[PDB]
């Protein structure tokens, strides 16, 4: 047994499933994309696409 806990906050979960949903809140809202080839990060899946082709 134990406690499925955030660790980042360490102070919150609604449940184990609650924590699972809550765990992703620290990735943040996805208004960006990470590069397939070199993993550089750009403010959209558009700026990333421009970066991708002229790599
Ligand atoms: Zn948290
Ligand atoms: Zn790249």
Whole-number Å distance, alpha carbon 28 to ligand 2 midpoint, is 21
* Residue positions counted in the chain: 55
Judged by its nearest atom, the ligand closest to the C-alpha of residue 21 is 1
Question: Maximum CA pair distance of the chain?
Answer: 51
CATH number at residue 35: 3.30.160.60
Nearby residues of 26 by Cβ (< 8 Å), 6 or more positions away: 6, 8
Method by which the model was determined = NMR
In the chain, DSSP assigns E strands to 33-34, 41-42
Domain of 45, in residue numbers = 1-55
Nearest to 50 by CA among 30, 29, 28, 35: 35
CA distances in angstroms from 55 to 21, 22, 31, 37, listed in the order given:
35, 35, 21, 9
For residue 21, the number of C-alpha atoms closer than 13 Å in the C-beta half-sphere is: 7
Strand partners, 17: none
């Amino acid at each position: 047994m134990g406690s499925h806990k955030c660790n980042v906050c360490s102070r919150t979960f609604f449940s184990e499933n609650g924590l699972r949903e809550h765990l992703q809140t620290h990735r943040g809202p996805a208004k960006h994309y990470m590069c397939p080839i070199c993993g550089e990060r750009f403010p959209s899946l558009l700026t990333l696409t421009e970066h991708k082709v002229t790599h």
